[PDB]
Design a protein around this ligand. Structure first.
Ligand SMILES: COc1ccc(-c2c(-c3cc(-c4ccc(C)c5ncccc45)c(O)cc3O)noc2NC(C)=O)cc1
Length: 207
């Protein structure tokens, strides 16, 4: 297990997300689904010139899986998946500029729901999760587990859990007062409100 420091700007963003009073938390789901959609777009595009990239799974879709026992909401996609370099360096590098822009926009009257317009929507997960665990698998690379409870650091390890195939699984360990996001009616409502036209099937599992 390797432990890494977030870039200072990203740690600042995470603290803002955790500390700011902001009631419209439900937008976290749209942001995560948007990320899944982007990843699905990419594997779809690449498969057009190299069909063998779908050897790790032809189905392009998103599953939403609530588990009341574990107090988790999991967002699973069969997108392109992330490499170790994505997790440690490259997505953070990209997030720096977006974070800066978002912070500045907030100072000028934007609100937290607009986070995705700055390309850093993943971090909205921390509106509802005390810890986020991300399992990801890119073709020709190993399966990784990324994890953070904020506080300025994250971990990455090679994952020996159940093999995924290809894609990304975001496991939201929900805060004690945010269990509404385990309820079928609530998740359905949010998907219809904010993610109605996503171009991949979204299956909401029930318990
Ligand atoms: C908005 O920027 C991105 C969106 C999706 C992805 C992504 C993902 C993916 C990442 C995330 C994601 C998960 C976890 C973290 C820390 C992320 N940080 C920045 C951007 C995305 C992150 C996710 O929630 C779902 C996803 O399907 N899997 O392969 C990907 N690769 C390509 C080039 O897009 C990467 C960047």
């Amino acid at each position: 297990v390797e432990t890494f420091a977030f870039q200072a700007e990203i740690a600042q963003l995470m603290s803002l997300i955790i500390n700011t009073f902001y009631s419209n938390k439900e937008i976290f789901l749209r942001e995560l689904i948007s990320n899944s959609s982007d990843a699905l777009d990419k594997i779809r595009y690449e498969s057009l010139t190299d069909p063998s990239k779908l050897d790790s799974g032809k189905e392009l879709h998103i599953n939403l899986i609530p588990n009341k026992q574990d107090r988790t909401l999991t967002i699973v996609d069969t997108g392109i998946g992330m490499t170790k370099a994505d997790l440690i360096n490259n997505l953070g590098t990209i997030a720096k500029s977006g974070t800066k822009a978002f912070m500045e926009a907030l100072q000028a009257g934007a609100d937290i729901s607009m986070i995705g317009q700055f390309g850093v929507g993943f971090y909205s997960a921390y509106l509802v999760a005390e810890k986020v665990t991300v399992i990801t698998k890119h073709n020709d690379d190993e399966q990784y587990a990324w994890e953070s409870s904020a506080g300025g650091s994250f971990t990455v390890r090679t994952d020996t859990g159940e093999p995924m195939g290809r894609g990304t699984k975001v496991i939201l360990h929900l805060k004690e007062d945010q269990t509404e996001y385990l309820e079928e009616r609530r998740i359905k409502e949010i998907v219809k409100k904010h993610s109605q036209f996503i171009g991949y099937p979204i299956t909401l599992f029930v318990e």
